Design a protein around this ligand. Structure first.
Ligand SMILES: C[C@H]1CN(C)c2ccc(-c3cccc(C(F)(F)F)c3)nc2N1C(=O)Nc1cccc(-c2cnco2)c1
Ligand SMILES: C[C@H]1CN(C)c2ccc(-c3cccc(C(F)(F)F)c3)nc2N1C(=O)Nc1cccc(-c2cnco2)c1
Ligand SMILES: CS(=O)(=O)NCCC1CCN(c2ncnc3cc(C(N)=O)sc23)CC1
Ligand SMILES: CS(=O)(=O)NCCC1CCN(c2ncnc3cc(C(N)=O)sc23)CC1
Ligand SMILES: [Zn+2]
Ligand SMILES: [Zn+2]
Lengths: 335, 335
């Protein structure tokens, strides 16, 4: 029911054009279109039946833990949601950086400029102020991170595709990781591409000083050490495609945790795997554009805590009240 | 999707017990039940498939005006919604009388006491203060009223079952009317049941003086002229049943305008007629417990205005921009 989604955004006063930024990436709709028209376009896209239909023999949280404890070769997709409890708000939320743009980053014109290679070459001052906010060694991994880490110890994790750049998966000790939009783990020079570790550059950044390449000529200004995050203008990591090529025909369980799935390439994964592969959702809010077999709604940690409790054994040792909506929705604390 | 309904009420902090007042009338759930349990009961009831399923060959507003201009023998159900534009808020809304109870009616214990025969016999002072607020000859009928009036002139109206007591249907000139919860049209004495017209008692009420029976002994206190509104403790008008007995097998089109359909006996009508009879909804908000073939959402007058415009002819002379949600929902101004 895309009604709820549209009505919700109609009273809030959302620009439908920015919604279409997600629904139609790599397409700029003409500026002559009025907002009443843009909204009907939005609706027309969401109301289209999804590629991958829901498996009807899979519905309950009981079904979910069964699949969890039985399945090897699991794929987990994680977004900004798994880190909010750690102290990092979604960039797109009200206490996030995009909404804080005029407050703390008046130099930046767009939210896009924060991760635009063309702006960064012009002026990297605002990126490194932000980098100090979410720098490794300031936040502890959430229960979700540790959960994923445990599944990897247990040999169940085919891959964790994460959208996060906070490198918490690193800290949590998750091995089989794929960071789609890169991470703060390393930093390369724009010029000579000399690579280095994050814990090194930490000091330079924590003291508001821009890291430059120790090997380049100091005359060079573009000699800057940039954390290997995928900026606008830059290509995706080629390992994503190499990983996804194999994974799609070996995955037997897909778990989406704490992601809106608004942003490619991760957003494409649920409809790029075999339709008989069970898909489970763990999120604060349901998704309008995709159908999942089991939908667990609320605080991601709260939900993982329940499953960990249910799975018992090793998973229970991680532990620090729902409503059932037939046939496959659950409401936990959170919305 | 009863999810939207439940989540909406969970953040607002609604007592699920008062929801169950509607979902389970004539059943008082035991007081030992905690609210988490009461909510799952609510969900369990709403998630039950409705008696009358939706006709799939009927979906659009084009389908709606076709049915409207083709059908004779039409049944229209109207609730508090058709009168809000006239100046009478829903009793259950924030500017309504139930929420104004502590402000303007501190004598009243319950909202129920306002229309409880046992309280009225104790103390009719608060009922007549309220009666002066919504008394006939203070509000003009809405576009919806006039619309229904026109359908009745045209011979299309089998019946208008209204929940309203404001008697605006009277003012609008609607003939084939059934006032399920009674109306201010007449007033009878509790004792001798001597009947009288409203425009008479107007003066007594407008001057905060209680009307008493001119024929009873003045010694009698219960000699009071009460507007023949159906109070708690009293039976429904027997004409409702007499009307519904015939109507259910002669109705070919059912229109619900401006009603939540929370309250019996009108709430029962959509599931008490043949399932092949097309049902159309005109309301500010969709209904969780019932399925309609076409759902027109927004300000009731705004919607009727569109249909009147479309129907042309006589209906257009009543006239004083939507979004389509496939396959059968429309969003107008209002929510
Ligand atoms: C409201 C209808 C008819 N109207 C309202 C339109 C008027 C204009 C456009 C339109 C024109 C130029 C460019 C675009 C653009 F796609 F947004 F770039 C849209 N699209 C639509 N409409 C669309 O449905 N457009 C549209 C555009 C792109 C994708 C889809 C679509 C709908 N379901 C799957 O894909 C639909
Ligand atoms: C949560 C389940 C099991 N639990 C949670 C319950 C625990 C207690 C009750 C219950 C006990 C006594 C009285 C009532 C009362 F019906 F509310 F009065 C409910 N009902 C339910 N439950 C119900 O589903 N109760 C219930 C009560 C009345 C109607 C329905 C129903 C569900 N679908 C159509 O009707 C369901
Ligand atoms: C979109 S791109 O390919 O050009 N790369 C540009 C940068 C992206 C980084 C990932 N994105 C996020 N967006 C919103 N919230 C969050 C919270 C995060 C966290 N705790 O790590 S990352 C994140 C998007 C931008
Ligand atoms: C429920 S009953 O059988 O015992 N009869 C008691 C009184 C009912 C009268 C009808 N009800 C309403 N409820 C909420 N809003 C409104 C707005 C109205 C209007 N403009 O006339 S009537 C109304 C309910 C109570
Ligand atoms: Zn260099
Ligand atoms: Zn009398």
């Amino acid at each position: 029911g895309p009604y709820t989604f549209v009505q919700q955004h109609l009273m809030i006063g959302t620009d439908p054009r920015t919604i279409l930024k997600d629904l139609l990436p790599e397409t700029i709709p003409p500026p002559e279109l009025d907002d009443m028209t843009l909204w009907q376009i939005v609706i027309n896209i969401l109301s289209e039946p999804p590629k991958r239909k829901k498996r009807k023999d899979i519905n309950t949280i009981e079904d979910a833990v069964k699949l969890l404890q039985e399945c090897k070769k699991i794929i987990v997709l994680t977004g900004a949601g798994v880190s909010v409890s750690c102290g990092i708000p979604d960039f797109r939320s009200r206490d996030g950086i995009y909404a804080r743009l005029a407050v703390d980053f008046p130099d930046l014109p767009d939210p896009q400029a924060m991760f635009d290679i063309e702006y960064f070459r012009k002026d990297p001052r605002p990126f490194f102020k932000f980098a100090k906010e979410i720098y490794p060694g300031q936040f502890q991994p959430s229960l979700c991170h540790k959960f994923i880490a445990l599944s990897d110890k247990e040999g169940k994790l085919l891959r964790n595709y994460t959208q996060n750049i906070d490198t918490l998966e690193q800290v949590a000790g998750i091995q089989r990781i794929i960071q789609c939009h890169g991470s703060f783990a390393t930093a390369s020079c724009l010029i000579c591409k000399y690579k280095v570790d994050c814990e090194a550059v930490r000091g330079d950044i924590f003291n508001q000083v821009v890291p430059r390449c120790p090997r380049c000529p100091a005359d060079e200004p573009l000699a800057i050490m940039k954390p290997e995050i995928v900026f606008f203008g830059e290509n995706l990591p080629e390992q994503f495609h190499r990983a996804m090529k194999y994974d799609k025909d070996e995955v037997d369980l897909l778990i989406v945790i704490g992601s809106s799935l608004k942003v490619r390439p991760v957003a494409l994964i649920p409809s790029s795997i075999p339709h008989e592969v069970p898909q489970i959702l763990i999120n604060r809010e349901p998704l309008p554009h995709l159908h999942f077999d089991v939908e667990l709604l609320g605080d991601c940690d709260v939900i993982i805590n329940e499953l960990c409790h249910r799975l018992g054994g090793e998973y229970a040792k991680l532990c620090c009240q729902y409503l059932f909506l037939p046939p496959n929705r659950y409401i936990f604390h959170g919305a």
